[model samples]
Target: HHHHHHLEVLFQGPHMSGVKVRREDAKKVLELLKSVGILDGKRKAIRDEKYVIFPVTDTNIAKSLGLEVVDVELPMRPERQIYKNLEDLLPREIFKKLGRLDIVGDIAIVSIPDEILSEREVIVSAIRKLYPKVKVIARRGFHSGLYRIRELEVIWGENRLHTIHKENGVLIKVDLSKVFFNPRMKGERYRIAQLVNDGERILVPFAGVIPYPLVIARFKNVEVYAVEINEFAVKLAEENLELNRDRLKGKIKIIHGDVFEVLPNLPNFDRVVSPTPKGVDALSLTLSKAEKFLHYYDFVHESEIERFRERVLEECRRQGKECRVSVRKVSDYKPHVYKVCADVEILS
Candidate 1:
């Protein structure tokens, strides 16, 4: 993806004492001011062709250093406010009506309530201020079809749906309209990558743009083979590998084929990671191809978590394999339902 250039504009405050120095001597004087606790922490330094002016709390200290001291107004450095949520940016009533906001690359995806439709402009501006680098603000809809791609309409900024996302030290190229990409699984990807050891052969199925394989290969020196049926996703996955080629420590061979048809023909791997699409079942197929570990993802109701574990154990029994299974709740998908990852270790 191409880059965007932006000019920064900040605010100026009241007059304060400043020390002036030739460009060549600025670093030494600034270091002295900082060590003495006289440098103004909230103001920015001014730079001219010949001299650099630094805001200082004490004019006496500036003169003590044999530097020219003058009274001058300087730009106030913006405070980095830690906004807990949108409540800090909008009125309480308006904030209470807003839903979740997710960011993918430079895009902000939000869910606006129907009752607050008229307040769209206010909400968009607030989001812009909250995420200053965000280039596109999209109103999101539910995920649909086998692709699990969300319906998004650009409410602000650029009209395009393609962007390069950075996460876990890897760059992923995603086109929202073409593939299924979820930024919420970043932590999960890191967790899986951390559990992976060097020199292991790994397989990732339903690898939508191959985030899991990319992240795992970024950290460990392993050979990862990823499978995907969607042609667009496979193309993006190929491009993503090249985008992060310089930083990755391992190699990834992407196989563009249906997981069901591909896994049976491919050799068993040290580990298998299935970021299974919602409503699709690949537990048995993924587990069968795993000689050591299989990380299976599925959506299950809260009350059925135990049953989910039992099902995995049953699969193990059917395959005549001794295994240990641990189920973890990764995220909430809906009311009383969760996105869970079951880590199965083939003991025998």
Candidate 2:
């Protein structure tokens, strides 16, 4: 006899929602439904210790499974369902090592550790089963070298690599294979934008698809200069600028070349931002051109923060510019490493 204890957890409404199944037929029955195109692709499955509840488009075959059918809708798909489903599919210890549930557009990205390396496919399958709305599943591979682009492999779903990501009300066109852009930096970009003043000059070296430039220019009366060495990114950035010009409070001039090459000949700007993915050395190149503000980013251990701070202090001094430097921790990169920003106030 099936237990009636889970009745409270199931919704009791008027729509034909889903069915319940035990360990035996949950996958088998769901596969049957998916084959018929009747599986509810939008909602994630709900599971308990004894049963897995599959959100289905219809309940025509529930009584035979001896589990009660629910004619109601779930409020929203909570991702914890995937966590539970994977528990049985992979070793419990390995499943928990899958890092953050990250999504950019319709793609779900995860980092699989060698700790769980053996069952990567099984983990990917469970993830797909848990979140079917996921158009693609991508994993971070080894570093792709000087471009600061990480290797991304599709573990599940289709092979498409490009999508438009909207952040801070600016349409950011991202091609996962071509340029480098981090969705995690949304707050960082917006925070810097709010400080921009009208008629001021802003330069963002290593701007990818011009997210910083486009976003910073949106509500400020400033001119944004974005430099990118990626030719395709420059083309896309120019197109994005044209598409969003109607909304921007300022304008952007994209320089389609290496900042190392472009910075030396560049006009001075009131503010310069080098959101370099790696080191803080690039900030020094713009030291001569920063009329007032310079925002430099780097990742370092807490022990190295002072070293980072002093280095910027030294750069300002080396450039013969009187400056005030402040360090702000942006995000945690890994064990003992943090993403920090050095805010330098240059004085003439």
Candidate 3:
């Protein structure tokens, strides 16, 4: 029962265990295992050759590929544990698709696919039972309008909306039913903060709840000018700025209006960022103020981002500036979509 040794499953077929390998060749061996498409969960060390796991997608083929097959009991994922309680109540198809839910303050945000909307009552009930700490439960709606706001409908618990979500060691207060916020971009927000060099001025167009700005402001000694069009988010952004004031290292200058209206008058910036699932409609304006870099985000493919790169260059040319661009996939945007960002190296 070396469960952690060959630790197990996910949305993929049958779980797997780890194969002990020389400390040096861990990645090499893992790639060799995954080359055939059977890698499941994560790989960890366990003595000399360390344990490796494989799913049951094609067991015979994996055996043929020169890998050992010692049947090991697999530990279940948290999602699977929650689903076990749900499988009896929900259709097998819908239960398996339930991967995760979000917790903001006392609220739990459940995003049920339209296919399982009828069973949302059971889904919400199961979650509420699993975590009684969550005082409210709401279903997230599709992102819409230029503001990218999503509608939320409370299915269980308290009907109240606004909640404080903490990310990258900061508190962000937003009306879950009103303002737009995507928990998916949490890691990406931290990564962008890491890219900030010493004393760099930043501009965040479409800054929602000041997550990106407040995050950067916490750990850096620079200036951040954040602009937001959604009045709902803007009010919360101001509150969040004040919430983190004593802890802030840098300063956040808030502009509570459309970026287009005030972007032209802002001082020059060393870098530009956008908290997205939104696009670069303000790219040209940001570029006008950009002295060093532009992190343009959009809902496009890695390959599709080339058009953004090309468009960025053309826009740079329009400003008589030299720029270089590369596409970095921020995160996967649900089913066939991707959250792509063009990391622009603006040479002044």
Candidate 4:
């Protein structure tokens, strides 16, 4: 019995009649499919249209296509489910303390309390009964705290993740081992880099580890005022800024405080990046406070993109600011949802 099943997935559709397919275009498409391990030397045409489907053994291939794993038919001997039930039953507090749980194929990776390992067998047994065909992999949780190292290291698996560290600012480590680093943010970082100019002042709210701010300050000629509320994250951010200060050329200022408290002390900025808050009420409160100091607001969120669009427009009107709003679908985020970023210009 096969423990895991692999199959080729294809994007089937007729080419627009007026769209001419150049040799280079066809070649590029084929290359992309091959690079993603979808093409497996098999070619088939349905009726008069050309169809492209390739054999896929790695589930990541489906992810590359923005498709979910729709079918999970695999021949295996195990009679119980592995990690699904544990994921479902784990108390919210325990799970939050452990952080997010991710399932990759038959393997379930979770970060949990160190003490829980003592009952590892019991946990595994329960999980196996729930997902017999699944494999449970546990890792120690990395608590958010100050480290003595001059440069902080966030490890994902055995490899050291690529990190943007700024002196006295923030450290952003993109763990490729995990799936969160989507292309949209990558593209936005590039776009922001292009748009920024020398002497332009910018503000980043809810900065977290400050990847966006670091990206802009490092690549563009702009001064960034970064604010993050999480103390552990703020400390890491500061260490990162110090580590990268020479490269950033002293363009970033890291501020520690709730954005609401910090905004009152900040002067107006030429541009602002406000990545969507996880909670709607919290974001609304932050926006209300930010109205006094913002010139342009680029809002980002996964849920309620349209709702936020309307909200920003209404808020601008109420605040007596003239603004223009533009939206971009950044990436398909979690299940049945997408990550989007909006650009709002508040004109004087």
What RMSD does each model have against the real structure?
14.8, 8.4, 15.9, 18.7
Candidate 3 shows a clash count of: 14
The model with the greatest TM-score is 1
Model 2: lDDT equals: 0.80
Q: Candidate 1 at residue 269, lDDT?
A: 96
Q: For every model shown, what is its TM-score relative to the native structure? A: 0.75, 0.74, 0.70, 0.48
Most accurate candidate by lDDT: 1
Q: Each candidate: what lDDT?
A: 0.90, 0.80, 0.74, 0.53
* Ten contiguous residues minimizing lDDT sum, candidate 2: 77-86
Which of candidates 1 and 2 reaches a greater lDDT?
1
Worst 10 residues of 4 by lDDT: 146-155
- Candidate 2 deviant stretches above 4 angstroms: 1-92, 125-132
Regions of candidate 3 where Cα sits further than 4 Å from its true position: 1-91, 96-100, 113-115, 276-280
Order the numbered candidates by TM-score, best leading. Answer: 1, 2, 3, 4
Clashing pairs in 2: none
Candidate 1 vs. truth: CA RMSD?
A: 14.8
lDDT of 1 by residue, 1-348 (tens): 433433222325444879889988887887898998889988988888999999987777678878799878889876877776677878788888777788899999898878987679879978998899999999888787767888888999999888999999999999998889989999999999999999999999898899999999999999999999888999999999999999999889999998899999999999999999888888899999999999999999999999999999999999988999999999988789999999999996
Model 1: CA > 4 A from native:
1-84
Report lDDT (Cα) of residue 61, candidate 3: 59
List ranges where model 4 is wrong by over 4 Å. Answer: 1-184, 281-306
